[PDB]
Design a binder for this molecule. Structure first.
Ligand code: 9X2
Ligand code: PRO
Length: 486
C-alpha cells in the first residue's frame, strides 16, 4: 500500500501519473524544468520501437544519417523562433556568431540537399535521423508527453513528383499505426490536420491521434507531412528531369517521439502501477518463490531456477527474485509496479503437484500450469496479454467519440471527457473562434479548456446533402474530430 500507487487513476490522474512513472523506475526528475531522465526501463522501450521502425523504413530504402545539433541564423532564416534555444558563449567568451539548437532539422538538412540532388538520377533521396531536439517552450511540461528536450526520429525524403511523395507520406503513417499497435498496444486515428494546425511549410499534415479517456484529452501520436515543393523553393532544391527541365523536388518529413511511451503508460497503466506490453518489457516473467516456513528452500530454489532455464533457453528473458530479506507479497507489488507482464509463483503446494501459478499483470487472472506446459502457456499468454491490452484500449477509444451536428451538443460531450465528430466548413478563421468559446464555457486540471480541431479522419462518414457546419452554418465539407488535448 504505502510502497504502491496511492492516487487512483480516475480520481487524481496527474498525481497517479507522476507516481507511476517514478515508482516504476521509468523517469527521474532533474533540476532543469521540462527535462527528464529516461531510466533503463524507459529507454528499453525506445530501443524496442527503434529496432522495429528501423527494420520497416529499411524496406522503403530510407537510410539513417546524423546532422549537426546546431544551425546558423542564415540557414534558419530561409524558413518556432520563440522556442529556439541559442548558444552565445563558450566558457566566458562570446561566440563570434550565435548558433541555434535544432528544434527540427529541415533547415539544417535541406541546406545541403541541393549539392546531393542535381538530376532525376539522384532521386528519390530518403534519410532518417534518430536524435534529440529542443523546443524551449514555457507551457507546463509533462514527462514523456510535453518536454523541452525529447528523443525522436525525423525522416526526410525528396521525390521527382507529388504522387511518389504522397504515397510515402501514407506508408510512413501506417508504420506509425503499427509502431503504436504492435509494440505499444495503443490504437490511433488517422487523419489530416486542419489548416490552422498543420506544420509550417507543409502542403498537408497527416497525423495519428490518440486519446486518453481517463482525463478526456487527445494527444497527437505521430505526424507525416507532405511538404510539396514549399521547402524546395526556400532552399533551391532543383533537379534536371528526364526532359532536361529544371523541377523542384517534392518532399516529405515525418516524426514520432518518446511521447509514444507516455501515451502507452497513460493508456494501459492501472492503480497497481505500470502495465507493459510484452514486446517492450525487458523481463517477460518474474518468478517469485513462496516458502511458507517450509525450511526446504533448496527444493523451491532448485525448481524456480529450472523454470528460469526453460524460459531463457527459449529466449524469453525473465528474472528469479530470490532476495532473502523480502516477503512474497513485497515481491508481487515490486514487479507489478514495474509492469512485468507475467508473474510465476512457486510454493510448496505447487512443488508437490509439479505445477506453478501463472499470474497475468493485465487482469490479474491466475491459473495453475504443469511444469512441462509452462513454456507453451507462457508464450501464448504473452500474446494474449497484448491482444487484450489493445482491444480494451480500442473499445475505450471508440467509446470516446460522440457524433454531433450542432454546437449545442458540444460542451456536454467535452464535460463527459469525450471527443466530438462534427460537420465542419474547415475555414481556418473558425478554429480560433471554436477554441475561444469552448474555453470560455469550460468551468472545472491545469491544462487548457479549449477544444481544438484534432484531425479530419481519413475514414469519413457520408456527408448528408444539406448538412451545415456545426459552427458557422455554412455548408459542411467533411467530418472533423475536435477535443481538448495535450
Ligand atoms: O512537442 C513536444 N514538446 C514541446 C516543447 C514543450 C515543452 C513544455 C511543454 C510543452 C511543449 C511542447 C514533445 N515533447 C515530448 C515528446 N514529444 C513531443 N512532441 C511530439 O510528439 N510531437 C508530435 C510529432 C510532431 C508534431 N507535429 C506538429 O506539432 C506539427 C505542428 C502543428 C501540428 N503539426 C512533433 C511534436
Ligand atoms: O517536426 C515535425 O513535425 C516534422 C516531422 C519530423 C521533422 N519535422
Amino acid at each position: 500500500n504505502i510502497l504502491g500507487i496511492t492516487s487512483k487513476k480516475i480520481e487524481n490522474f496527474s498525481d497517479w501519473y507522476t507516481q507511476v512513472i517514478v515508482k516504476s523506475e521509468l523517469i527521474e526528475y532533474y533540476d532543469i524544468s521540462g527535462c527528464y531522465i529516461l531510466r533503463p526501463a524507459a529507454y528499453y522501450i525506445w530501443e524496442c520501437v527503434q529496432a522495429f521502425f528501423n527494420k520497416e523504413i529499411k524496406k522503403l530504402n530510407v537510410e539513417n544519417s546524423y546532422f549537426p545539433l546546431f544551425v546558423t541564423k542564415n540557414k534558419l532564416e530561409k524558413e518556432f523562433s520563440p522556442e529556439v534555444a541559442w548558444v552565445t558563449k563558450y566558457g566566458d567568451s562570446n561566440l563570434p556568431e550565435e548558433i541555434a539548437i535544432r528544434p527540427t532539422s529541415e533547415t539544417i538538412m535541406y541546406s545541403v540537399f541541393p549539392k546531393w540532388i542535381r538530376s532525376y538520377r539522384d532521386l528519390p533521396l530518403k534519410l532518417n535521423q534518430w536524435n534529440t531536439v529542443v523546443r524551449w517552450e514555457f507551457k507546463q511540461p509533462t514527462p514523456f508527453i510535453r518536454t523541452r528536450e525529447f528523443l525522436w526520429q525525423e525522416g526526410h525524403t525528396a521525390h521527382k513528383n507529388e504522387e511518389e511523395a504522397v504515397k510515402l507520406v501514407f506508408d510512413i503513417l501506417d508504420l506509425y499505426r503499427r509502431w503504436y499497435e504492435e509494440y505499444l498496444a495503443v490504437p490511433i486515428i488517422k487523419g489530416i490536420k486542419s489548416e490552422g494546425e498543420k506544420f509550417g511549410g507543409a502542403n498537408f499534415t497527416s497525423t495519428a491521434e490518440a486519446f486518453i479517456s481517463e482525463n478526456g484529452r487527445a494527444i497527437q501520436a505521430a505526424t507525416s507531412h507532405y511538404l510539396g515543393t514549399n521547402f524546395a523553393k526556400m532552399f533551391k532544391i532543383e533537379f534536371e528531369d528526364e526532359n532536361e527541365v529544371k523541377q523542384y523536388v517534392h518532399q516529405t518529413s515525418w516524426g514520432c517521439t518518446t511521447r509514444s511511451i507516455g501515451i502507452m503508460i497513460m493508456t494501459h497503466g492501472d492503480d497497481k502501477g505500470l502495465v507493459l506490453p510484452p514486446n517492450v518489457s525487458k523481463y517477460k516473467v518474474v518468478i517469485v518463490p513462496i516458502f511458507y516456513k517450509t525450511t526446504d528452500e533448496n527444493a523451491i530454489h532448485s525448481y524456480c531456477k529450472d523454470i528460469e532455464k526453460i524460459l531463457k533457453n527459449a529466449q524469453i528473458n525473465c528474472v528469479y527474485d530470490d532476495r532473502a530479506s523480502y516477503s512474497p507479497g513485497y515481491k508481487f507489488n515490486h514487479w507489478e509496479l514495474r509492469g512485468i507482464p507475467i508473474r510465476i509463483e512457486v510454493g510448496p503446494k505447487d512443488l508437490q503437484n509439479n505445477s506453478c501459478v501463472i499470474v497475468r499483470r493485465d487482469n490479474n487472472e491466475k491459473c495453475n500450469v504443469k511444469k512441462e506446459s509452462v513454456l507453451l502457456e507462457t508464450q501464448q499468454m504473452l500474446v494474449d496479454i497484448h491482444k487484450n491490452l489493445f482491444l480494451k484500449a480500442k473499445k475505450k477509444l471508440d467509446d470516446s467519440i460522440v457524433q454531433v451536428t450542432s454546437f449545442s451538443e458540444v460542451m456536454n460531450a467535452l464535460n463527459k471527457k469525450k471527443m466530438v465528430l462534427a460537420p465542419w466548413c474547415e475555414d481556418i478563421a473558425t478554429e480560433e473562434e471554436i477554441k475561444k468559446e469552448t474555453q470560455r464555457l469550460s468551468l472545472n486540471t491545469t491544462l487548457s479548456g479549449a477544444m481544438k480541431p484534432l484531425c479530419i479522419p481519413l475514414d469519413q462518414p457520408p456527408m448528408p446533402p444539406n448538412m451545415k457546419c456545426f459552427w458557422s452554418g455554412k455548408p459542411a465539407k467533411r467530418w472533423c474530430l475536435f477535443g481538448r488535448s495535450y
